[PDB]
Design a protein around this ligand. Structure first.
Ligand SMILES: [Zn+2]
Length: 30
């Protein structure tokens, strides 16, 4: 799976593109 390895985070998604959806809350430019 694809896991969000963000500081203070750690969520796992079966789609790199829900992963990149979630990564939304951390990211602005990306
Ligand atoms: Zn995250």
């Amino acid at each position: 799976p694809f896991x969000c390895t963000w500081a203070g985070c750690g969520k796992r998604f079966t789609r790199s593109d829900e992963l990149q959806r979630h990564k939304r809350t951390h990211x602005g430019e990306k």
